[PDB]
Amino acid sequence: MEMEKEFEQIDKSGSWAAIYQDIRHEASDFPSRVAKLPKNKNRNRYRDVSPFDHSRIKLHQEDNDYINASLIKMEEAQRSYILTQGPLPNTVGHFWEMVWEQKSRGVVMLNRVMEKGSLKCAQYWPQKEEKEMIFEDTNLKLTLISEDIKSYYTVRQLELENLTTQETREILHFHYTTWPDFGVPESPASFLNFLFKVRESGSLSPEHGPVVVHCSAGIGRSGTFCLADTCLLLMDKRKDPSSVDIKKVLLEMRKFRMGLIQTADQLRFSYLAVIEGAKFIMGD
Ligand SMILES: CCNc1ccc(C(=O)O)cc1
């Protein structure tokens, strides 16, 4: 079923809450035993959001290999993503270790450091060129190189140095700064513009490690970004683009990380972004 017809039918019937609960009911349930070990309690932002054991990213250290991050491998689309929580004061060094070890080119951040008057993640990158950050626990240095501030997003170039070997890499930080404190954006136009800026950078391409994507918990906004990207890629690739089923792509993604897409509005909005994306590409 052409998803815009499916969309109009769910909208006119006001059944978004019913479709969303059906997804919640069919979603995979896998063990998360490492996440729940007592030694890991201060590495988790939220008690009810944990990576599955089978898909968790392992840090390359014998001490404690745990970070709250998941590899989402989309086989038919040929895209991988790492979805993670916003870093905590005591996990900023682990975050940048993971970026280094997984060979990522890009970091995609979909939240503000403060929202609704509370801290949603640590200030994990330098705000001035001349004040670099040193992470003594993982032996890394991070420097701001340049900053490009636009109306809906900011792009930063960062230099990450492994102080152990003195190798350096350029990381691109893509920061979506305008997602509202409550609900979802009214139009998907600025979110699609942002997605195409990430794609244009090389950050999502197979010559690099997987892109790192986060919001506060790493499931809601983060889930929207990777679901919209994967659905548009499948429409480009397949002979029958009308066969792309957004609900089936979401269930496949939920085999790798729990709770992706947190509300019926986020589902409805994910449908909105994919529909608007399919016509910009038909070049109406
Ligand atoms: C036949 C109705 N459904 C679709 C039409 C065109 C495309 C596309 O060319 O991206 C995707 C779906």
Curated annotation (Swiss-Prot):
Primary location recorded for the protein, binned into one broad class: endoplasmic reticulum
Active site annotation, chain numbering: 215
Tissue expression profile of the protein: Expressed in keratinocytes (at protein level).
Modified residues (Cysteine sulfenic acid (-SOH)): 215
Cross-link (N,N-(cysteine-1,S-diyl)serine (Cys-Ser)): 215-216
One biological process term in Gene Ontology: cellular response to angiotensin
Gene Ontology annotations for the cellular component aspect, listed alphabetically: cytoplasm; cytoplasmic side of endoplasmic reticulum membrane; cytosol; early endosome; endoplasmic reticulum; endosome lumen; glutamatergic synapse; mitochondrial crista
A GO term, aspect molecular function: protein kinase binding
Residue ranges constituting the Tyrosine-protein phosphatase domain according to the UniProt record: 3-277
Top EC category: hydrolase
Family listed: Belongs to the protein-tyrosine phosphatase family. Non-receptor class 1 subfamily.
Function recorded in the entry: Tyrosine-protein phosphatase which acts as a regulator of endoplasmic reticulum unfolded protein response. Mediates dephosphorylation of EIF2AK3/PERK; inactivating the protein kinase activity of EIF2AK3/PERK. May play an important role in CKII- and p60c-src-induced signal transduction cascades. May regulate the EFNA5-EPHA3 signaling pathway which modulates cell reorganization and cell-cell repulsion. May also regulate the hepatocyte growth factor receptor signaling pathway through dephosphorylation of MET.
Name used for this protein in its record: Tyrosine-protein phosphatase non-receptor type 1
Organism: Homo sapiens
